[PDB]
Amino acid sequence: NKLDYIPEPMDLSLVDLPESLIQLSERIAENVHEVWAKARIDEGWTYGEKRDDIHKKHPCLVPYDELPEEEKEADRNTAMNTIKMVKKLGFRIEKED
Amino acid sequence: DYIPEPMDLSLVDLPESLIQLSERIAENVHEVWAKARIDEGWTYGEKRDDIHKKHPCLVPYDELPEEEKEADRNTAMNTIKMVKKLGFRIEKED
Numbered sequence: 001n002k003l004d005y006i007p008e009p010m011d012l013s014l015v016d017l018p019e020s021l022i023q024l025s026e027r028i029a030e031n032v033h034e035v036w037a038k039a040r041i042d043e044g045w046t047y048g049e050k051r052d053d054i055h056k057k058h059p060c061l062v063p064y065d066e067l068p069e070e071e072k073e074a075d076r077n078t079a080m081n082t083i084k085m086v087k088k089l090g091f092r093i094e095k096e097d
Numbered sequence: 098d099y100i101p102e103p104m105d106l107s108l109v110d111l112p113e114s115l116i117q118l119s120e121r122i123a124e125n126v127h128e129v130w131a132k133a134r135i136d137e138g139w140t141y142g143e144k145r146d147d148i149h150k151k152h153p154c155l156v157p158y159d160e161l162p163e164e165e166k167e168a169d170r171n172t173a174m175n176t177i178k179m180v181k182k183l184g185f186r187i188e189k190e191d
């Protein structure tokens with residue numbers, strides 16, 4: 001092996017987010033996916049049952065609801081980790097009156 | 098037949114103190130992403146290979162092409178703009 005890289009993510013296990021926000025994690029993940037998909041469809045990518053760099057085919061190029069549950073969980077957790085980092089970095093997150 | 102329509106976040110204002118920390122946020126999402134692939138047997142290779150589990154982005158975040166860091170930063174900021182658009186205050190604690 002040539003490269004010796006060990007990822008060390010920040011410990012966000014004890015960062016608490018409003019329950020109201022976590023209740024919306026699907027809403028956030030869905031929009032993240034829409035942004036992702038629009039960027040790939042604008043580059044000529046299309047849906048295909050196997051990923052393919054040469055023919056620009058991706059299986060995840062579907063509406064968010066049609067994704068496998070495993071893939072939605074990923075998207076929801078990515079979203080929550082990105083926000084937990086905001087809180088870890090010293091910002092308050094509060095639902096507006 | 099499927100047309101993505103992301104929320105219009107063009108007018109959502111985030112505190113400048115936070116946008117300054119884009120790279121810290123982007124760098125951590127990359128670490129979590131990288132940690133998950135390496136735990137499943139992925140390694141760095143300069144071409145992506147779904148078969149030998151080789152990905153060119155399995156490098157320290159600072160070693161990424163600027164185009165890739167730029168993508169990660171914008172992704173992080175759109176996720177946080179969604180929070181603000183969904184009715185949440187984001188303010189630095191002083």
Ligand SMILES: OC[C@H]1O[C@@](CO)(O[C@H]2O[C@H](CO)[C@@H](O)[C@H](O)[C@H]2O)[C@@H](O)[C@@H]1O
Nearest residue numbers: 032033034036060067071074075078130
């Ligand atoms: O485990 C899947 C992995 O993909 C990520 C990339 O950060 O999500 C992006 O790519 C997905 C398909 O590969 C899209 O469905 C998703 O919308 C997009 O944000 C992570 O969320 C996840 O860890």
Ligand SMILES: OC[C@H]1O[C@@](CO)(O[C@H]2O[C@H](CO)[C@@H](O)[C@H](O)[C@H]2O)[C@@H](O)[C@@H]1O
Nearest residue numbers: 036126127128130131154165168169172
């Ligand atoms: O594939 C690039 C594409 O994936 C995103 C998530 O949608 O970033 C993820 O994948 C990157 C490597 O491909 C990682 O560096 C990053 O941390 C991870 O979240 C997009 O930002 C990017 O356009």
